[PDB]
Design a protein around this motif. Structure first.
Motif, PDB file in Angstrom:
ATOM      1  N   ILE A   1     101.595  63.317  10.545  1.00 49.74           N
ATOM      2  CA  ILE A   1     100.780  64.323   9.785  1.00 49.74           C
ATOM      3  C   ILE A   1     101.090  63.903   8.241  1.00 49.74           C
ATOM      4  O   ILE A   1     100.188  64.130   7.535  1.00 49.74           O
ATOM      5  N   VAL A   2     102.428  63.212   8.065  1.00 54.64           N
ATOM      6  CA  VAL A   2     102.618  62.795   6.535  1.00 54.64           C
ATOM      7  C   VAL A   2     101.873  61.746   6.269  1.00 54.64           C
ATOM      8  O   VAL A   2     101.133  61.748   5.069  1.00 54.64           O
ATOM      9  N   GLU A   3     101.295  60.874   7.220  1.00 52.86           N
ATOM     10  CA  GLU A   3     100.498  59.661   6.899  1.00 52.86           C
ATOM     11  C   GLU A   3      99.045  60.034   6.628  1.00 52.86           C
ATOM     12  O   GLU A   3      98.503  59.529   5.724  1.00 52.86           O
TER      13      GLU A   3
ATOM     14  N   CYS B   1      98.008  63.525   5.712  1.00 50.18           N
ATOM     15  CA  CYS B   1      97.971  64.433   5.066  1.00 50.18           C
ATOM     16  C   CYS B   1      98.715  64.439   3.703  1.00 50.18           C
ATOM     17  O   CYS B   1      98.367  65.136   2.442  1.00 50.18           O
ATOM     18  N   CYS B   2      99.892  63.683   3.565  1.00 53.64           N
ATOM     19  CA  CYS B   2     100.564  63.508   2.377  1.00 53.64           C
ATOM     20  C   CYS B   2     100.263  62.182   1.576  1.00 53.64           C
ATOM     21  O   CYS B   2      99.954  62.341   0.354  1.00 53.64           O
ATOM     22  N   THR B   3     100.447  61.199   2.080  1.00 53.42           N
ATOM     23  CA  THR B   3      99.950  59.831   1.560  1.00 53.42           C
ATOM     24  C   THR B   3      98.315  59.644   1.746  1.00 53.42           C
ATOM     25  O   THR B   3      98.216  58.665   0.828  1.00 53.42           O
ATOM     26  N   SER B   4      97.725  60.274   2.518  1.00 55.06           N
ATOM     27  CA  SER B   4      96.176  60.398   2.158  1.00 55.06           C
ATOM     28  C   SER B   4      95.964  61.768   2.213  1.00 55.06           C
ATOM     29  O   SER B   4      96.696  62.716   2.369  1.00 55.06           O
ATOM     30  N   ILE B   5      94.607  61.891   2.074  1.00 59.82           N
ATOM     31  CA  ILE B   5      94.118  63.440   1.562  1.00 59.82           C
ATOM     32  C   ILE B   5      94.006  64.038   3.128  1.00 59.82           C
ATOM     33  O   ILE B   5      93.336  63.497   3.955  1.00 59.82           O
ATOM     34  N   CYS B   6      94.526  65.161   3.312  1.00 60.50           N
ATOM     35  CA  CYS B   6      94.445  66.171   4.226  1.00 60.50           C
ATOM     36  C   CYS B   6      93.096  66.520   4.518  1.00 60.50           C
ATOM     37  O   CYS B   6      92.213  66.423   3.870  1.00 60.50           O
TER      38      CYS B   6
END
Lengths: 21, 29
Positions: free
Chosen positions: A2-4, A6-11
């Motif tokens: 989820i971090v890749e 939604c956080c490092t890319s747009i969720c």
């Protein structure tokens, strides 16, 4: 993970709902 | 409010609002 997606890319609503129970 | 970069507590808060009674799992890996 989820971090890749939604956080490092747009969720998205689709991505968040992948993690609902 | 979901179409942005969401990190840390912001991401967990979005899951809480979106998933509601379904609950969710948060696995930062």
């Amino acid at each position: 993970g989820i971090v890749e997606q939604c956080c490092t890319s747009i969720c998205s609503l689709y991505q968040l709902e992948n993690y609902c129970g | 409010f979901v179409n942005q970069h969401l990190c840390g507590s912001h991401l967990v808060e979005a899951l809480y609002l979106v998933c509601g009674e379904r609950g969710f799992f948060y696995t930062p890996k």
